[PDB]
Amino acid sequence: KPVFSEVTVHDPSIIKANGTYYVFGSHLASAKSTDLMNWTQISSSVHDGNPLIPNVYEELKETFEWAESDTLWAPDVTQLEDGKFYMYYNACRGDSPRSALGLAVADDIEGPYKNKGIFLKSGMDGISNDGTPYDATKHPNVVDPHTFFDQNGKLWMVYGSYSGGIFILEMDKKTGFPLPGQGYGKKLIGGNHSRIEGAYILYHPETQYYYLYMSFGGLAADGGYNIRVARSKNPDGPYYDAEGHAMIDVRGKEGTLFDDRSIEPYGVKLMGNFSFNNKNGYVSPGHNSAFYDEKSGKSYLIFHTRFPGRGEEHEVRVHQLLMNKQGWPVVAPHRYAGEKLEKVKKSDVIGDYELVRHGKDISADIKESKEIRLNQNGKITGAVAGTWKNTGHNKIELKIDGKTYDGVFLRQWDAASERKVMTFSALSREGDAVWGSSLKR
């Protein structure tokens, strides 16, 4: 029987070193595991003695002073070619995009990290890093970085939260700082205080797309946080959703703040708030990272989540990512327990399921699963009427609610009944996800 050990790390950013997985999150929090199931908490908050930066208030004083905050927001740690660990740290006042983004470097992944300096600021009253006066409708909040190598070995950093949008900068592979002359870099999506943050870019060698993951909505339990994805053949875009909408054009209306209605039609929404059979479930799952394992070919979505009825409590969750026939990733409905893709036959997948329809909205509503049956005759009955078929090794196609969904079947552990179940997870061109988890073991 699978065993989990939980940790609390907001906005987890995954990195593997020395055969061990680490997550680095906000508030200088971190955790590690060798199996992605049993995590050990390393650090939890910004304070004297935090092992990652034990003198943090002195070490990063310029950042705390600029941001007028006593904590840190969502970092990234990335190993560069010198073998050292580069932490892109940031702080934000919280009520406005008054933020600083800097670089610290460690010899060892668990610290200590040493400050190399601030290299981006937002929320100044005056000249911004692009030379024009700072304007949060068009300039980023300098937080939430992800620094990554593309398949050509070029180093990039994508970043941003709300404010002027999500931007990407080309980075110096030797110093870890941005190449000169870029200002805030190139916009990928957003503007006008859109609720979009937590960018993360992952390349998949089979489809040869870069996937731009991002979180729409608000992180709190009333915020409707949801992970969405878009893709491009290039690390720096242009990024498109499954309807071919250009992410660069997605933003709230001029003169508005947090215009969710304008942005929610866009992107492929992978997961919102849900509860299978009203047992446990997730609320505002989001701010993800993602990992592709070259050895196994498996991919993983790593994120934090809140929970129905548990207020603002959050923990790290890991779900396997599968790849549908169209080259869009689908999230396995249950957390990772060591399971792998297998050949399924018709008798394996026929039967009753709990169905979650995540939809395409930004919504704080917790969506309850409803019962359907995948009948032997290829029809879906119960909560919805439709059709389905299994193709290839383990692909599913469903037709429901006027749409066609392409996805993948996967046997998983259900941690609410302590039993193995059959699942499917699929996506429509329209960008909404459906999950099924079988009533049968």
> What is the set of active-site residues?
11, 197
Binding of Ca ion at residue 169 (CB under 5 A)? no
* Nearer residue to Ca ion within complex by CB, 355 or 396: 355
Neighbours of 216 (CB within 10 A): 26
What is the Cα–Cα distance from 255 to 258, expressed in whole angstroms?
A: 10
Q: Which is nearer to Ca ion, 16 or 55 (CB)?
A: 16
Cα gap 373→184, rounded to integer Å:
51
Piece of the chain touching Ca ion by CB under 5 A; list 13-21, 79-87, 122-130, 307-315: 13-21
Contact in structure between 37 and 336 (CB atoms under 8 Å): yes
Q: How far is the CB of 342 from Ca ion (least distance, A)?
A: 26
Q: Which distant-in-sequence residues (6+ apart) come within 8 Å of 316 by Cβ?
A: 6, 7, 8, 9, 12, 23, 31, 39, 302, 303, 304
Measured CA to CA, the distance from residue 143 to residue 102 in angstroms comes to 10
Q: For residues 32-53, b (16+ Cβ closer than 10 Å) or e, as one string?
A: bbebbbebeebbbebeeebebb
Minimal distance, residue 360 CB to Ca ion, in Å: 8
| Strand duo 367-368 + 274-275: pairing | parallel
Sequence-distant (≥ 6) Cβ neighbours of residue 323 within 8 angstroms: 204, 206, 207, 299, 329, 330, 408
Cα(7)–Cα(148) distance, rounded to whole angstroms?
25
Minimum distance between the CB of residue 76 and Ca ion, rounded to whole angstroms?
6
Would you say 429 and 243 are in contact if contact means Cβ atoms under 8 Å apart? yes
Determine which residue in the list 23, 28, 74, 422 makes contact with Ca ion, applying CB under 5 A.
Answer: 74
Confirm or deny that 287 is annotated as ligand binding: yes
371 is in an annotated binding site: yes
Taking contact as CB under 5 A, which single stretch among the options 43-51, 71-79, 125-133, 151-159 is the one that binds Ca ion? Answer: 71-79
- Residue 171 Cβ vs Ca ion, minimum distance, rounded to whole Å: 16
C-alpha to C-alpha distance for 86 and 381, rounded to whole angstroms: 53
Give the nearer residue to Ca ion in terms of CB position, either 13 or 284.
13
3-state DSSP call for residue 381? Answer: strand
6-14, 39-47, 305-313, 325-333 -> range binding Ca ion (CB under 5 A): 6-14
Q: How distant is the alpha carbon of residue 173 from its chain centre? A: 25
Least distance to Ca ion, CB of residue 397, Å: 20
Binding-site size for Ca ion (CB under 5 A) equals 3
Q: Which is nearer to Ca ion, 262 or 277 (CB)?
A: 277
Contact string 224-263 vs Ca ion (x = CB under 5 A): ----------------------------------------
CA separation, residue 107 to residues 29, 86, 115, 241 (Å): 18, 9, 12, 39
Helix (H, G, I), strand (E, B) or coil at 435: strand
- The amino acid occupying position 189 is I
Determine, following the binding rule CB under 5 A, whether residue 215 of this chain makes contact with Ca ion: no
**Dihedral sign (CA 254, 270, 185, 30):** positive
Tokens of 211: 């996937």
Residues between 271 and 290 with contacts to Ca ion, criterion CB under 5 A: 277
Q: Smaller CB distance to Ca ion: residue 74 or 394?
A: 74
| Residue 268 vs 395, nearer CB to Ca ion | 268
277 is in an annotated binding site: yes
13 is an interface residue for Ca ion by CB under 5 A: yes
Tell the smallest beta-carbon distance from residue 287 to Ca ion (Å). Answer: 6
Phi, psi of 45 (to 5 degrees): -155, 170
Q: Which is nearer to Ca ion, 54 or 265 (CB)?
A: 265
Asked if residue 140 has a cis previous peptide bond (ω within 30° of 0), the answer is: no
Report 93-132 residues binding Ca ion (CB under 5 A): none
Cβ atoms of 372 and 382 closer than 8 Å:
yes
Q: Output 145 or 252, the one with its CB closest to Ca ion.
A: 145
Which residues line the annotated binding site for Ca(2+)?
A: 277, 287, 354, 371
Q: Which residues are annotated as a binding site?
A: 277, 287, 354, 371
Can you give the binding site for Ca ion, defined by CB under 5 A?
13, 74, 277
